[PDB]
């Protein structure tokens, strides 16, 4: 005869029990459910008929055996109440009273918590628009008053993201991640005189330190990823701006340096997240540590993508650019899109595949800034092609899955990915005259 | 306005009466798919000639 | 694999810009570029030169620190001594790769051979991070060890119900001598030397297993390890031979490599009580 | 004979002694070669997490549709 060994757990209204079962699977469930009830229960609520269900899906048709319904040996099945019809929707003869009755059936009753959300969002908007208006006043009129306004806003929001870490955690993280804007503005405008490398160096240093300490706090593990992203981005732009400050360097050098940093950060997300991880409980914080490790991976991946696209726009927004620069940009883009195959998180893959889209958009805005409108139209054309690829992959999942492709094709994909993320190096060495630095000194 | 408020609250009251009656009738007459869980329970043959 | 080809390419194009030699620095760059290329790119019967440098350094550092005894506290393993060591119980033990909502990170079988006598251990472990929910459901205290004990006991119950006598045991013997010193060809001791070999998988594996059993040795550990989904299990096979004399400098048989310079981790990985998977990767079968 | 999920009855016994009544379902199986082994109950203290994580798929076609 046929039998099947499946594990079942009763959920119920009390802490259930997971057990194995050796059930014969040739006969309707209705003949075996009482067996499961006898097994997993330790044996009125207006009783309900109980039936097996896939651990995530909806209950089985109660007349279908475990062969004519998707079940394999060793599967996990849950014990759910069979679906039943909703109670007959009450009918209210009047209209106005019917309106007031049927509206409150799902409405949130405005209370203090709505006022709290409103005030938090209002304060966030104030932080943003105050930074914006003050920094505009600074750069435009130079009256040195916007300087004071933004400095005060930065101090206040930092003190605020430090003070409220016991009254609400969300305020802490939210005001910190917004403070990332006014401290950036205050430090970028805080170096006197002309604009250049020192301003961006100070701003990157400030945002790096602020993200570092705010991630040291961590009342909500939601803002870990954002602070990691901004910390690593700040470190990257800090190194680059320190370079461009100590000794003058061209745009191509900055571009290739930033793209290289992005490549290294992306390909070393494992190592970087590893070093980032820095009455009785034994591995009871494992959910927290795992969630934070995922957060750190997503953050540093986002920072890699951002550094890559920043360097690309840097050495991809110049009216004159060697086609080697175009190769660097496009190869970095394809390298990100192809490294998106190695991770297993939706938020890491999203960033790696959005490198290409973000690059298209950033090139678009950059070309629109300069007088290059014809270049912007072509960037927009490439954007259209890219979203077309997105759509075509979304409509036909046969393309989307990796099991459609045989292992030789997958290994060829891997070889191409390594080839691109490698060959970015000598072409970078050729774009900037690094060989000239040794041949002719 | 007074009459219609009174009418709304008496509508709510009679709807409570109706839902009570319906809950009683559903306690007595469950759906047939429920009947498989009745036997071997304190309620298995409950109706007696006073009900 | 990526940095090597990257820097090799850098030095290649460096040389190509110096194919005319009319300056002493051009000769310098030709020499240094060819040197860097041949160092970054070489072969020594299965390895790069840089891998061998790194493995020499790692072997030296492990020599300088004999103590290696410690195991992860976020993945736990159980070992079941199978007395009859049947080769027909493979379906169920490979079926426990992913069953009952408990995903076992790897399921290995280890046969130890001495004389005619041969004992067997079906070991298997679970990575708590891999199946986090199914542990977090037991209690918010994450009973990894307890859950893996349950999985082991359930395997033992299923197999006994099949008829094969199985006994959960902890304390099983260790292939690697804990007193030895890691050499380039296996690890030595005051007794005979043991060296581990990664057996290549093919459509001829069982012959290689019989031959591994046959060859002269103090001890002969062999271990299959399945991993992945139980409907598509990837295999990987290792085998440690403990032979009295010093081991040969070449793979004593056909279709297996000594993994020259990497034996302490390979041997500890062969310890059934260990949690780490075996060295390398292999194809499904 | 064996109850649906239970362990098969011994050949040296009577239906009354192992216990059966006029409504029970018995499946005709073959007595286990080795000793019949008990089932062990794993105490579960929270089912909401299993249900909530079984409703999770990493980068399925649904994510690609959302991104498109």
Per-residue 3-state assignment (H helix, E strand, C coil) for C178-244: CCCEECCCCEECCCCEEEEEEECCCCCHHHHHHHHHHCCCCEEEEEEEEEEECCEEEEEEEEEEEEC
| Chain A residues close to D59, C-beta within 8 Å | 344-346, 349
Cβ neighbours around C117 below 10 Å, total: 7
**Rg of chain D's alpha carbons, rounded to an integer?**
22
Nearest to C230 by CA among C107, C88, C78, C77: C107
| Nearest neighbour of B34 by CB, restricted to A34, A48, A92 | A48
Six token digits for residue C42: 């070489």
Locus of tokens 């490549």: A263
* CB environment A95-109: b (16+ within 10 A), e (fewer): eebeeebeeeeeeee
Within A41-168, residue ranges assigned H as helices are 96-103, 112-141, 145-163
D39/C160 Cα distance (integer angstroms):
12
Q: Is A199 helix (H, G, I), strand (E, B) or coil?
A: helix
Tokens, residue C236: 């990987």
Q: Comparing C-alpha atoms, which of A408, A392, A388 is closest to residue A400?
A: A392
* Residues of chain D neighbouring C103 (CB-CB closer than 8 A): none
What does DSSP say about strands A76-81 and A3-10: parallel, antiparallel, or unpaired? parallel
The residues pairing with A52 across neighbouring beta strands, listed in sequence order, are A79
Contact present, C15 and C30 (Cβ < 8 Å): yes
From the list D34, D40, D49, the residue facing C154 with the nearest CB is: D40
Q: Which residues contact B51 (CB under 8 A, 6 or more apart)?
A: none
C-alpha distance from A437 to closest chain C C-alpha (Å): 11
CA C173 to chain centre: 17
Give contacts of A 255-274 with C, CB under 8 A. Answer: 267
Closest C-alpha among A172, A175, A133 to residue A157? A175
Phi/psi of residue C24, nearest 5 degrees: -60, -35
Angle subtended at Cα C43 by Cα C37 and Cα C44, rounded to the nearest 5 degrees: 140
Could you identify the residue written with the tokens 């650019």?
A321
Element (H, E) at A77: strand A76-81
Separation CA B28–CA B35 (nearest Å): 11
Q: Which residue has the tokens 């009918």?
A: A91
Q: How many residues does chain B have?
A: 51
Q: Does A286 touch chain C (CB under 8 A)?
A: yes
Burial of C121 (0-12, 13-18, 19+ CB in 10 A): buried
Q: Angle CA(A267)–CA(A273)–CA(A277) in degrees, nearest 5? A: 165
Contacts with A281 from chain C: Cβ below 8 Å: 141
Q: Catalogue the E-assigned strands of chain C.
A: 75-82, 98-99, 102-103, 106-114, 117-127, 166-168, 181-182, 187-188, 193-199, 219-229, 232-243, 256-257
Task: Report the alpha-carbon distance of residue A366 to residue A363 in Å, rounded.
Answer: 5
The structure tokens listed for A344 are 């297993």
CB pair distance less than 8 Å for D51 and A78: yes
Q: C25 and A439: CB-CB below 8 Å?
A: yes
Q: A274-282: long-range contacts at Cβ-Cβ below 8 A with a sequence spacing of 24 or more?
A: A276/A228, A276/A300, A280/C141, A281/C141, A282/C73, A282/C141, A282/C142
- Method for this entry: cryo-EM
Side by side, which strands form the sheet with A50-54? A50-54, A76-81, A3-10, A17-24, D42-43
Contact A233, A261 (CB under 8 A): no
Question: How far apart (Å, rounded) are the C-alpha atoms in residues C247 and B12?
Answer: 92
Structure resolution, Å? 3.7
Q: Which residues of C69-101 are buried (b: 16+ CB within 10 A; e: fewer)?
A: eeeeeebbbbbbbbeebeeebeebbbbbbbbbb
Instruction: Show residues of chain A in contact with C26, CB under 8 Å.
Output: 439
3-state class of B25 per DSSP? helix
In whole angstroms, give the CA distance from residue A70 to residue A53. Answer: 10
What spatial distance separates the first Cα and last Cα of chain A, rounded to whole Å?
84
DSSP letters of D2-63? EESSSPPPPSSS-HHHH---TT--EE-----SS-------EE-S-SHHHHHHHT--TT-HHH
Element containing residue A52 per DSSP (H, E): strand A50-54
Do C234 and C226 meet the contact criterion of CB atoms below 8 Å apart?
A: yes
């Amino acid at each position: 005869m046929p039998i099947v060994r499946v594990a079942v757990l009763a959920a119920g209204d009390d802490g259930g029990r997971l057990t194995e079962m050796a059930l014969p699977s040739e006969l309707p469930l209705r003949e075996i459910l009482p067996a499961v009830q006898r097994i997993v229960q330790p044996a009125a609520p207006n009783p309900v008929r109980l039936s097996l269900a896939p651990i995530g899906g909806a209950p089985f048709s109660l007349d279908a055996t475990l062969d004519t319904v998707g079940v394999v040996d060793g599967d996990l099945l849950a014990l759910q109440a069979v679906p039943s019809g909703p109670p007959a929707p009450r009918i209210v003869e009047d209209i106005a009273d019917a309106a007031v009755i049927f509206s409150e059936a799902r409405r949130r009753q405005w209370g203090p918590t709505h006022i709290a959300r409103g005030a938090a969002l209002a304060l966030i908007g104030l932080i943003l628009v105050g930074t914006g208006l003050s920094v505009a006043h600074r750069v435009i009129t130079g009256d040195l008053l916007g300087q004071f306004i933004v400095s005060g806003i930065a101090l206040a929001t930092v003190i605020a993201a430090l003070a409220v870490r016991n009254r609400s955690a969300v305020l802490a993280t939210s005001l910190a991640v917004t403070a990332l804007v006014p401290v950036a503005a205050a430090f970028a405008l805080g170096v006197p005189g002309d604009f250049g490398a020192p301003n961006v160096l100070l701003a990157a240093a400030g945002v790096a330190a602020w993200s570092l300490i705010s991630m040291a706090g961590s009342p909500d593990d939601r803002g870990i990823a954002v602070f990691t992203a901004t910390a690593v981005t700040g470190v990257g732009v800090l190194l680059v701006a320190g370079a461009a400050s100590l000794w003058v360097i061209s745009s191509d050098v900055i571009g290739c340096a930033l793209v290289l940093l992005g490549l290294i950060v992306t390909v070393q997300a494992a190592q970087l997240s590893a070093m980032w991880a820095r009455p009785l409980s034994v591995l009871a914080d494992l959910p927290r540590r795992v969630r934070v490790s995922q957060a750190h991976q997503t953050g540093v991946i986002a920072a890699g993508v951002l550094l890559g696209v920043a360097g690309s726009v840097a050495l991809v927004s110049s009216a004159n650019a060697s086609p080697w620069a175009w190769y660097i940009v496009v190869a970095a883009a394809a390298g990100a899109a192809l490294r998106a195959r190695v991770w297993d998180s939706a938020a890491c893959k999203a960033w790696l595949l959005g490198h290409s889209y973000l690059l298209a958009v950033a090139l678009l805005v950059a070309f629109v800034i300069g007088d290059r409108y014809q270049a912007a139209l072509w960037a927009l054309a490439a954007l259209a092609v890219l979203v077309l690829v997105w759509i075509v992959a979304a409509l036909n999942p046969k393309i989307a899955s990796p099991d459609t492709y045989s292992l030789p094709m997958r290994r060829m994909v891997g070889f191409l990915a390594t080839g691109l993320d490698a060959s970015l190096i000598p072409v970078m060495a050729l774009l900037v005259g690094l060989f000239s630095l040794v041949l002719d000194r | 306005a007074d009459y219609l408020r009174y009418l709304s609250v008496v509508r709510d009251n009679v709807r409570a009466h109706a839902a009570e009656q319906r809950a009683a009738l559903e306690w007595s007459h469950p759906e047939p798919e429920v009947l498989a869980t009745i036997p071997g329970t304190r309620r298995q043959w409950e109706r007696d000639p006073r009900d | 694999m990526t940095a090597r080809i990257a820097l090799a390419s850098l030095f290649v194009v460096a040389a190509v810009l110096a194919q005319p030699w009319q300056t002493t620095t051009q000769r310098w760059v030709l020499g240094v570029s060819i040197a860097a290329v041949i160092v970054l790119l070489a072969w020594w019967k299965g390895m790069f030169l840089t891998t061998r440098i790194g493995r020499a350094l790692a072997m030296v550092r492990r020599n300088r620190a004999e103590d290696t005894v410690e195991t992860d506290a976020h993945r736990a393993t159980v070992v079941l001594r199978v007395d009859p060591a049947a080769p027909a119980q493979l379906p169920v033990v490979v079926g426990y790769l992913d069953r009952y909502g408990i995903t076992c990170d790897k399921v290995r079988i280890t046969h130890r051979d001495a004389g005619g006598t041969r004992r067997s251990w079906i070991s298997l472990t679970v990575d708590a991070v891999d199946n986090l929910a199914a542990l977090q459901a037991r209690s918010a205290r994450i009973p990894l060890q307890d859950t893996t004990e349950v999985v082991g006991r359930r395997l033992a119950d299923h197999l006994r119900e099949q008829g094969w006598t199985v006994t959960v045991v902890e304390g099983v013997d260790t292939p690697l001598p804990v007193s030895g010193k890691e050499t380039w060809r296996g690890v030595a001791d005051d007794a005979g030397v043991v060296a581990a070999y990664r057996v290549k998988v093919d459509d001829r594996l069982d012959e290689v297993l019989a031959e591994i059993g046959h060859l002269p040795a103090e001890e002969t550990w062999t271990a299959l390890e399945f991993t992945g989904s139980p409907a598509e299990p990837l295999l990987t096979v290792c085998a440690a031979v403990r032979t009295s004399d010093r081991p040969a400098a070449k793979a004593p048989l056909a279709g297996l490599t000594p993994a020259r310079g990497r034996h302490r981790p390979a041997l500890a990985a062969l310890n059934p009580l260990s949690t780490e998977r075996l060295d390398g990767t292999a194809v499904p079968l």
